[PDB]
Ligand binder design. Sequence first.
Ligand SMILES: Cc1n[nH]c2[nH]c(=O)cc([C@H]3CC[C@H](CC#N)CC3)c12
Length: 283
Amino acid sequence: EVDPTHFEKRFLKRIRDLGEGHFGKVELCRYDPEGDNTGEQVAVKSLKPNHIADLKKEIEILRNLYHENIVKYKGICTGNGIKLIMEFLPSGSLKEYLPKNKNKINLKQQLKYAVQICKGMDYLGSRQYVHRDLAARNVLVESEHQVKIGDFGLTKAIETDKEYYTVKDDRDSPVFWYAPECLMQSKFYIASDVWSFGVTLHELLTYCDSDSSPMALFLKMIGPTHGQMTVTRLVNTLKEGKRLPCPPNCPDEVYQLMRKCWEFQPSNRTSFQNLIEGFEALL
Ligand SMILES: Cc1n[nH]c2[nH]c(=O)cc([C@H]3CC[C@H](CC#N)CC3)c12
């Protein structure tokens, strides 16, 4: 019998590199058994040359997630060493899509994408998981009307009888998408992911312009060349009460909901289900 989720490594042939996430690297590949370039194009995540247990945990997370605004698990490709086979969204991430499609995508469509991310993140949060990496580069574009969350490499399960995941390894962390308690105390909540959405929402409203990215804007405020002290400087700036400014051609009613995602203490911060009600009211 043939398992459809069991992808043989020999048939799987590469096309291009799509992205790389700390240790795992994601490559576009054509799975073509018959050998005439008629095969299905699939996204193929695998380890950069261990973090096999981390990838195996990521695989088992994604396999059991079923949601419209979350990327589809297609299968696995297994000597040891394992590869995660996902569906291929050709339009790509918001980082690549939004700059190239400013004419098609308007504020009304941007808020629809924003709701769809929250619906994916609320589904994720309700299943006792914490994402730890919500940024525009990880938000994929299925079509002009649909977006999906297309990476779960830093996704971890919230522990037993506790409201946060105690972070151990944090070498390459997106510090400019991270809330103060993640930077300071190194313990990641669901309310932390709301902060990360707030920055993703800013990225979305700015059409993922590199000149006005979160990294670029924070570096303009705190200082461009401080290196090792950058993160402690970044906290001290957020302690004073200095947030990312309102994007150009962004309403205050949108920006105020974005500001509610960046309240200092997580206990008095807005949630995803609350944000859906906020955006839909404007729609
Ligand atoms: C899955 C995935 N399926 N289809 C796609 N098309 C893309 O252009 C990019 C991707 C992904 C490539 C890997 C990055 C990881 C990061 N940071 C997320 C985005 C995918």
